[PDB]
Design a protein around this ligand. Structure first.
Ligand code: CLA
Ligand code: CLA
Ligand code: CLA
Ligand code: CLA
Ligand code: CLA
Ligand code: CLA
Ligand code: CLA
Ligand code: CLA
Ligand code: CLA
Ligand code: BCR
Ligand code: SF4
Lengths: 165, 31, 91, 73, 73, 146, 41, 35, 742
């Protein structure tokens, strides 16, 4: 895709410095290659590395990246629609995954707190129940919203131990 | 133009008086 | 002995250089057989060394082929024995 | 220019450390909970755990992500 | 004064060095500016500050030093 | 500049964490409820209760001074490198090498320490020998502090 | 047997297995979808 | 004349003489018994 | 006089996973369960503290024996891995043909995240991580010419590892020996001298003679490894072996008639280095191992076991007493036959000293073909074995202190050689501390004065070679006597032990295998520094051991334990009083000293030994700047740290980029250790209280209560990360530098 220049950053696809970066790396690869005869396995490995570099640079060109004066891609994280894949979408993926991990943990700690000996189950994890809670934590945002609305997400002030101050 | 010797020594004597006054203040503080 | 051994080093030097290049290429390629697509999931179900030994590998098998090529007659080859029980778990 | 910038930044950092130290000293020697009952200061004592925990959170987030981006680069 | 004449091509002087431990290379290498003795190059900006506030000659600086001596007393 | 300002923010937030923790737990905490009866600066409350080393608010200050020195050093390293790049006329050096730590270690610290460490050497000395001696002097004091 | 399974369910062994598997999946994703600076769109 | 004389006198005065007297004096006071 | 015999309890413990399912079974406080997060660290800390688990010494001895079996199984796994990698993941066969120009490499990385760049151009049509363990040189010196031989011994090593584990299981669960079995030290020495060292050295001498010697002779002559006859064709075919070395045409007749001079062609005393490979003469090494075997076989018949001939070590201890030492060595036999920690202290001390000697003797007398020429492996081996030695010595101090606190009984040590040491520990420690101060003042002012004089522009007042001659006259004398040893005091030696003494610089393929080492004023200063740092480490460790039970500050310290944080802020403050804390500081200084030893080694070798002869004199790596720059701290900072860091810091974009990343990472870990070191538990516990409040707010409060690390554990973590970061920084620096410069 063709992205508009933003914050004084030209698109990497049409950036001469991006082409120079690609060129330089590829030439370095060639130099590394030259000492190896083509039949030997390092020669093929280096040619595959060159291919990988070319397709990486091409993919970065097409992915609507903005490059700077240095010639390397720069991320726009202000929320711009043209660069949402830089931070927003992977940000949403992280927020979903991290909240899943945390909610699986919270659910297991609350469930194990009802056991006869909670601290032993804290180190010897009940794998079937654990996995059940882990897969139930797929709908973490919903269940967290329910806990927030019902007031059971947060313990009241009086129950929590505090310093004498 | 460098400073005259009389200028340096006058300032140094003023400094000596200032130092005496600093000693008076230090003694008064120590009480 | 050393005289004739040096003489046949001189007479076989190119073949042994090819052998050393092939075994080194095999040893290096042994880290890239899936990336390059030689011992993929079907063929490497058992040992991919066994694949090179028995079946076909771009570099590993090559070595397996030339490793005992053009060696001294009467003596078992320096690179491999005449026989051996299979490598432990194709490892 | 470099010497003056370094000078004033190091002096500022030390003075800041002193300001916070003297406030801790105020809380020990000079703070009266009975007289300051109900004002913002006693309220600070009341939700100190929240303040410290959120300071720990922001510090942990900043350090994890800044160090990670630096190590990645 | 000389610094005021050529601010961009004269290194400011802080104070003369009288170190008994200096060797002859040290005495010959620390003599910067137009000094005839080993000196330290004033990196505190006092020259630019005093030039900006209108002080031009050593007499003005001496008068100021004497006045601040009187103020300190 | 993004990454270094976030490093600065880390330093300020952590130093403030340590100092605010010292101030608010100065009068007592769960480990030592009666901390206000021991004054501002005391060594500890013994090895009992698991250990109470560096429990006083004075000790919180002592710990926060390290983070303060670290943060201020980060800020002035940023200042000095950015300005050195500006003053040589090649700002691209900082803009290229400030995104990764090896760039700071190589193109700023190692690169600009060449003339400093050559203040004195077996081939005589120059006007930077005093600053070389002070550099090594400060290294000595830092280690003795350790 | 069952006790050994319980031993496996211990925190260290389970952490090692879980992070071994996780590193494996992440490595496989970086092999089949390599060099991903940003989510494409 | 001040420039050729005063440094060579006052640098030892402030860096050898005054330190010696000050340290000796402070020692005598600090070790001085309360009575 | 108990009879030495085999004693066993049959099936003492059943083989079952019930204890695996229950963490902390070995203890009583840890068995009940985790109340707080301290329990995890306690579990791991006393995992191998067998004395604190069971009171009886029999069970402890069985646990130690089977744990040793498990360690040996682990070592055999590691060896199997190294040989297997040298077979399927290396260029050993290519390196065999061109050892001077092909870089050894036995590790290849998978091409996943761009890490394939670490597969450097090591030569031979191969790519991988260049290795510095010297394994290729070892295999070449052992006569390995094919990857099948490496594979075969790797599989053997894996089988042996399985056998070692099976032996540990057998000797804990099936055939655990009784306590009276382990206490047969006479028999132990008889076997571990005659049978472990004696027969082991004999076996290796036989290998060297029959396998390594002919194969390496053919390699020296220029024969292709793929054309060399196989080792069994030399060991069995006597005509083939006699063709290379004509003494084998006489069989064993000269051996059994004391006509051993006929074996002089393959059992030599040449001394020096092989000019082709740059390693010790293999005939010399074979003769060496033969004589070592004989000496140990004879020395292993010293002690009486079951027949009246021999010595009783108790008697020879007790008979050594004198006017200054009271009862002498009486009671030490009881110490060292009823305390594992005492034996562990002695054995660790000697192992550490030995590893140090091993490093010295291997750089100076390279025992492997094409080892000296490969500067990277030589530096790596030296530095490695130095660090191992210093660590083992610190552990020796620790276990000495552990014995002193736990297993020392005043009743059985009344007026013996140990009790009198405990009765004038004040004199010992004060004299050592005085020595330590003296040494530091003199040596550091030797550097600081030089820094000051150079900065003041007074090179004539420096302690350099030109200005003030502090010549190491005694070391130069020793060098002279050793260079002249083959003429007067070692007449049958054809050459000196090392070329480092003097004359006839050894070069292989341009690069210098070995060069005579000079000793100027910088060598004097750095050696006195070494002595200073050693003496301070010894001060710390010996003070910890001697004051392990009591002091004028804390008299009742024995019952506080070997490992306690303090006795309180009273008495002015009693922090770090335990002998464990002395090992902490002792460990720190050990690290510091090694850091100077290996820096001296690296700079001196790069400047005055390593290099390349081009027919116009030596072209050293750094150009011989050590002698004139290593007399100043600025010189080490600039010409060694700053100058030689260019390889590691500019390593990005090459195969050494991993070394650069580790350099930074180890810097980080060292600074991260400073957190644990400069802080204390109370702060961290209060921060945990705030964080626990935050968790309790959201009902995420763990059942196991979060706790700050114990003060001992905090110090432990601090020293561990400090040692890790410092050593790994030096590792990355040394390896990147020496690999890039070559
Ligand atoms: C390669 C990518 C990468 C990696 C390795 C990490 C790694 C980490 N992140 Mg980061 N992060 C990333 C990308 C990444 N992050 C991106 C792209 C974003 C933008 C969305 C974030 C935003 C982010 C935040 C905001 C936080 C982290 C935190 C953390 C740490 C714990 C995360 C976790 O799941 O714990 C397991 C998860 C839990 C125990 C549950 C805790 C709550 C989680 C973190 C969020 C759920 C709350 C909810 C959505 C509301 C969010 C409010 C927020 C917007 C302020 C860990 C060091 C946390 C941290 O260390 O701070 C102290 C943290 O607070 N990350
Ligand atoms: C206007 C500023 C100001 C004022 C009035 C005070 C006043 C006070 N402070 Mg505060 N403080 C300040 C700034 C200030 N401080 C700053 C900036 C810091 C941060 C560094 C501190 C940190 C601090 C702490 C942590 C504590 C105090 C305490 C005190 C009290 C006693 C000081 C003392 O113990 O004796 C005088 C102090 C000394 C003699 C020690 C000075 C030692 C210095 C650091 C040596 C420096 C070496 C030198 C620079 C090296 C030379 C160069 C080298 C090349 C040779 C007093 C009320 C103490 C107290 O009991 O409070 C009630 C206390 O616990 N303050
Ligand atoms: C480079 C050195 C270093 C580093 C990394 C830290 C890091 C930290 N300190 Mg410490 N500290 C140090 C030096 C250092 N300190 C020194 C010398 C002092 C003076 C005594 C202090 C004093 C100090 C105090 C007094 C306090 C801190 C706090 C903190 C935290 C600040 C929050 C943050 O940045 O989170 C980000 C965290 C990090 C960068 C830590 C490393 C995390 C790594 C990157 C993750 C590793 C994952 C990887 C898989 C590991 C492999 C290991 C494998 C073998 C197991 C953090 C844990 C504060 C705190 O607890 O806030 C909550 C606090 O109160 N520190
Ligand atoms: C000291 C012991 C030791 C060490 C540190 C290593 C380290 C390594 N080995 Mg080796 N290895 C060893 C012993 C060791 N090995 C032994 C004893 C055997 C025989 C049983 C092997 C057999 C072996 C093979 C067959 C291979 C490795 C490979 C590797 C690498 C990747 C490990 C892997 O697959 O990820 C861990 C994977 C899982 C946990 C699943 C790594 C450099 C691989 C390699 O070099 O790839 C190019 C490879 O293919 N190793
Ligand atoms: C000829 C006799 C002989 C030999 C070779 C050894 C060799 C060894 N003993 Mg000793 N030992 C002997 C007699 C012998 N022992 C006697 C008579 C006793 C009773 C008084 C002991 C009591 C004893 C104790 C208490 C311990 C040892 C340990 C060790 C090992 C130390 C590790 C080492 O150096 O690795 C060298 C490594 C090798 C040589 C590799 C091969 C390893 C195998 C085990 C060598 C086989 C030795 C064995 C005696 C012969 C097989 C007999 C078996 C079939 C019954 C070493 C393998 C320690 C150890 O590590 O425990 C396992 C240990 O804790 N030994
Ligand atoms: C441990 C080290 C070691 C080993 C194993 C050997 C081994 C050998 N050496 Mg060497 N050697 C060594 C050290 C060693 N050497 C040292 C240190 C020196 C320097 C002095 C020499 C110098 C030397 C010379 C100069 C010569 C040898 C030779 C030999 C071979 C002759 C063996 C022989 O017939 O003697 C007699 C051996 C025996 C009687 C033992 C055989 C007993 C068998 C195994 C009994 C098995 C019976 C079983 C119970 C039942 C049978 C059936 C069953 C298999 C199914 C043999 C391969 C000779 C040779 O040919 O080399 C090429 C030779 O000329 N050696
Ligand atoms: C022959 C060697 C030997 C043997 C048999 C022992 C055996 C023992 N030691 Mg001794 N010790 C040794 C060497 C040895 N040590 C050395 C070389 C040192 C110097 C460092 C010490 C210092 C020492 C101290 C200071 C103490 C002991 C203690 C102990 C006992 C308990 C150990 C335990 O359970 O901890 C299990 C092991 C650990 C908890 C260590 C974990 C790993 C650490 C952090 C290092 C890992 C570094 C690693 C290589 C780097 C990479 C990490 C990577 C994953 C990132 C046990 C009797 C303790 C005791 O109570 O004695 C009775 C004790 O306090 N030892
Ligand atoms: C560079 C930092 C540094 C320095 C200088 C010292 C210095 C010292 N340590 Mg410390 N130490 C340090 C870091 C340092 N340590 C660190 C980080 C650790 C880890 C925790 C330790 C751990 C430690 C322990 C555990 C022990 C020491 C001991 C010693 C002493 C050893 C004797 C010696 O060096 O001779 C004398 C001192 C020096 C040479 C120091 C430098 C002084 C120079 C030469 C200047 C000379 C005088 C000069 C001209 C000034 C006069 C004029 C002035 C007034 C203006 C000495 C006081 C040991 C000890 O005290 O017993 C002897 C001891 O047991 N230290
Ligand atoms: C301990 C280390 C050390 C040593 C050996 C030296 C040595 C020297 N310095 Mg250097 N210096 C050092 C540290 C050291 N310095 C440090 C750390 C600094 C601070 C930066 C300096 C700064 C410095 C300066 C600035 C100068 C020197 C100078 C000198 C020289 C003359 C000093 C003098 O007059 O001594 C006087 C000495 C004594 C009064 C007594 C010495 C001790 C006696 C001999 C001990 C004998 C005890 C005996 C064995 C006991 C017997 C007992 C028996 C009766 C029973 C001399 C070469 C001067 C120079 O230029 O000369 C080259 C000079 O200008 N030094
Ligand atoms: C944007 C801008 C603006 C605005 C600004 C502002 C508004 C700012 C602010 C700023 C601020 C707002 C700052 C702050 C700071 C703070 C601080 C720095 C603090 C500190 C604290 C402390 C130090 C404490 C102490 C204490 C304690 C500790 C306790 C007791 C008490 C006391 C207080 C003593 C304007 C438009 C105007 C202009 C432009 C720019
Ligand atoms: S450890 Fe913490 S508590 Fe125990 S003495 Fe040292 S400082 Fe006081």
């Amino acid at each position: 895709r063709d992205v508009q220049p933003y914050a004084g950053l030209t698109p990497c696809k049409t950036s001469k410095a991006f082409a120079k970066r690609e060129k330089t790396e590829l030439k370095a690869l060639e130099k590394r290659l030259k000492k190896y005869d083509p039949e030997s396995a390092p020669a093929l490995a280096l040619q595959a590395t060159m291919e990988k570099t070319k397709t990486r640079f091409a993919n970065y060109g097409e992915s609507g990246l903005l490059c700077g004066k240095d010639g390397l891609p720069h991320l726009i994280v202000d929320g711009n629609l043209e660069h949402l894949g830089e931070f927003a979408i992977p940000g949403l993926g992280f927020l979903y995954v991290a909240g899943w991990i945390g909610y699986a943990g919270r659910s297991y700690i609350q469930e194990n707190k009802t056991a006869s000996k909670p601290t032993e189950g804290e180190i010897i994890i009940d794998v079937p129940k654990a996995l059940g809670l882990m897969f139930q934590a797929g709908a973490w945002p919903l269940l967290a919203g329910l806990e927030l609305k019902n007031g059971t997400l947060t313990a009241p002030e009086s129950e929590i131990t505090v310093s004498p101050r | 133009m460098p400073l005259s010797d009389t200028q340096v020594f006058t300032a140094l004597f003023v400094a000596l008086i200032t130092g005496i006054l600093s000693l008076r203040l230090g003694t008064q503080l120590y009480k | 002995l050393t005289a004739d051994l040096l003489a046949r080093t001189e007479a076989n030097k190119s073949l042994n250089d090819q052998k050393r290049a092939a075994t080194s290429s095999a040893n290096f390629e042994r880290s890239r057989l899936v990336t390059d697509g030689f011992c993929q999931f079907p063929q490497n179900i058992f040992g991919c060394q066994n694949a090179a030994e028995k079946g076909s590998v771009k570099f590993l098998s090559d070595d397996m082929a030339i490793e005992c090529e053009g060696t001294a007659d009467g003596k078992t080859c320096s690179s491999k024995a005449p026989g051996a029980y299979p490598s432990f778990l194709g490892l | 220019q470099a010497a003056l910038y370094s000078h004033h930044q190091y002096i500022a950092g030390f003075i800041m450390c002193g300001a916070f130290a003297h406030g801790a000293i105020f809380f020990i020697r000079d703070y009266d909970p009975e007289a300051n009952k109900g004002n913002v200061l006693a309220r600070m004592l009341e939700h100190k755990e929240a303040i410290i925990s959120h300071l720990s959170w922001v510090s942990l987030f900043l350090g994890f992500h800044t160090l990670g981006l630096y190590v990645h680069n | 004064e000389k610094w005021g004449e050529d601010p961009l091509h004269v290194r400011p002087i802080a104070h003369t060095i009288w170190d008994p431990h200096f060797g002859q290379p040290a005495v010959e290498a620390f003599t910067r500016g137009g000094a005839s003795a080993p000196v330290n190059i004033a990196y505190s900006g006092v020259y630019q500050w005093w030039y900006t506030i209108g002080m031009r000659t050593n007499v003005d600086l001496y008068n100021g030093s004497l006045f601040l001596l009187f103020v300190a007393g | 500049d993004f990454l270094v300002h976030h490093a600065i923010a880390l330093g300020l937030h952590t130093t403030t964490l340590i100092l605010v923790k010292g101030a608010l737990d100065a009068r007592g905490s769960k480990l030592m409820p009666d901390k206000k009866d021991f004054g501002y600066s005391f060594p500890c409350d013994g090895p009992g209760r698991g250990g109470t080393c560096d429990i006083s608010a004075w000790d919180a200050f002592y710990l926060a001074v390290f983070w303060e020195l670290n943060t201020v050093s980060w800020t002035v390293f940023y200042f000095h490198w950015k300005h050195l790049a500006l003053w040589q006329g090649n700002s691209a050096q900082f803009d290229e090498s400030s995104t990764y730590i090896m760039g700071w270690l190589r193109d700023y610290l190692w690169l600009n320490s060449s003339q400093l460490i050559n203040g004195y050497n077996p081939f005589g000395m120059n006007s930077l020998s005093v600053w070389a001696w002070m550099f090594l002097f400060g290294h000595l004091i830092y280690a003795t502090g350790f | 047997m069952k006790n050994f399974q319980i031993y496996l369910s211990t925190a260290p062994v389970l952490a090692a297995v879980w992070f071994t598997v996780l590193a494996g999946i992440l490595i496989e994703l970086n092999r089949f979808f390599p060099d991903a600076l940003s989510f494409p769109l | 004349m001040a420039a050729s004389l005063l440094p060579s006198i006052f640098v030892p005065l402030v860096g050898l003489v005054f330190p010696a007297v000050a340290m000796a004096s402070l020692f005598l006071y600090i070790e001085k018994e309360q009575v | 006089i108990k009879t030495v015999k085999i004693v066993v309890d049959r099936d003492p413990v059943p083989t079952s996973f019930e204890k695996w399912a229950k963490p902390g079974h070995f203890s009583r406080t840890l068995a009940k369960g985790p109340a707080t997060t301290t329990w995890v660290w306690d579990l791991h800390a006393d995992a191998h503290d067998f004395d604190s688990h069971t009171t009886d010494l029999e069970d402890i001895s069985r646990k130690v024996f089977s744990a040793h079996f498990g360690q040996l199984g682990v070592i055999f796994i590691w060896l199997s891995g190294m040989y297997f990698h040298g077979a399927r993941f290396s260029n050993y066969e290519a390196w065999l043909s061109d050892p001077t120009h092909i870089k050894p490499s036995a590790q290849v990385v998978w091409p996943i995240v761009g890490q394939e760049i670490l597969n450097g151009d090591v030569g031979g049509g191969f790519q991988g991580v260049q290795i510095t363990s010297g394994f290729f040189q070892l295999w070449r010196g052992s006569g390995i010419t094919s990857e099948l031989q490496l594979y075969s011994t790797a599989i053997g090593a894996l089988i042996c590892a399985g056998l070692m584990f099976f032996a540990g299981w057998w000797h804990y669960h099936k055939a655990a020996p009784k306590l009276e079995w382990f206490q047969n030290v006479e028999s132990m020495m008889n076997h571990h001298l005659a049978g472990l060292l004696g027969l082991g050295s004999l076996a290796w001498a036989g290998h060297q003679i029959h396998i390594a010697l002919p194969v390496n002779t053919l390699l020296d002559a220029g024969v292709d490894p793929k054309e060399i006859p196989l080792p069994h064709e030399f060991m069995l075919n006597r005509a083939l072996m006699a063709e290379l070395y004509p003494s084998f045409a006489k069989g064993l007749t000269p051996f059994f008639t004391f006509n051993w001079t006929e074996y002089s062609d393959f059992l030599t005393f040449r001394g020096g280095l092989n000019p082709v490979t740059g390693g010790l003469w293999l005939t010399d090494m074979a003769h060496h191992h033969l004589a070592i075997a004989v000496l140990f076989l004879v020395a292993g018949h010293q002690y009486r076991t079951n027949w009246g001939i021999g010595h009783s070590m108790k008697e020879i201890l007790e008979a050594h007493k004198g006017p200054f030492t009271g009862e002498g060595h009486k009671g030490l036999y009881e110490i060292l036959t009823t305390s594992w920690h005492a034996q562990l202290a002695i054995n660790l001390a000697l192992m550490g000293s030995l590893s140090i000697i091993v490093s010295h003797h291997m750089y100076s007398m390279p025992p492997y073909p094409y080892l000296a020429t490969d500067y990277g492996t030589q530096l790596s081996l030296f530095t490695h074995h130095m660090w191992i030695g210093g660590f083992c010595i610190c552990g020796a101090a620790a276990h000495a202190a552990i014995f002193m606190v736990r297993d020392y009984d005043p009743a059985t040590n009344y007026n013996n050689v140990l009790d009198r040491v405990l009765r004038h520990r004040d004199a010992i420690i004060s004299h050592l501390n005085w020595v330590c101060i003296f040494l530091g003042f003199h040596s550091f002012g030797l550097y600081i004065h030089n820094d000051t004089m150079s900065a003041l522009g007074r090179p004539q007042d420096m302690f350099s070679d030109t200005a003030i001659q502090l010549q190491p006259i005694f070391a130069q004398f020793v060098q002279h006597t050793h260079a002249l040893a083959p003429e007067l005091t070692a007449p049958t030696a054809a050459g000196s032990t090392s070329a480092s003494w003097g004359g006839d610089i050894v070069a292989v393929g341009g690069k210098i295998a070995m060069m005579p080492i000079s000793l100027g004023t910088s060598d004097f200063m750095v050696h006195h520094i070494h002595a200073f740092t050693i003496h301070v480490t010894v001060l710390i460790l010996l003070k910890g051991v001697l004051f392990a039970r009591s002091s004028r500050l804390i008299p009742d310290k024995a019952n506080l334990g070997f490992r306690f944080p303090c006795d309180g802020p009273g008495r002015g403050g009693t922090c770090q009083v335990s002998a464990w804390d002395h090992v902490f500081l002792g460990l720190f200084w050990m690290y510091n000293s090694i850091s100077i030893v290996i820096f001296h080694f690296s700079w001196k070798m790069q400047s005055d030994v390593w290099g390349s002869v081009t027919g116009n004199g030596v072209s050293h790596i750094t150009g011989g700047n050590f002698a004139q720059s290593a007399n100043t701290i600025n010189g080490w900072l600039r010409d060694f740290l700053w100058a030689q860091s260019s390889q590691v810091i500019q390593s990005y974009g090459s195969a050494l980029s991993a070394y650069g990343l580790i350099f930074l990472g180890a810097h980080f870990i060292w600074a991260f250790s400073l957190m644990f070191l400069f802080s204390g538990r109370g702060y961290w516990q209060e921060l945990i209280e705030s964080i626990v409040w935050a968790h309790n707010k959201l009902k995420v409060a763990p059942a196991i209560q979060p706790r700050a690390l114990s003060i001992t554990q905090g110090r432990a973590v601090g020293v561990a990360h400090y040692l890790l970061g410092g050593i790994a920084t030096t590792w990355s620096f040394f390896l990147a530098r020496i690999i890039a410069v070559g």
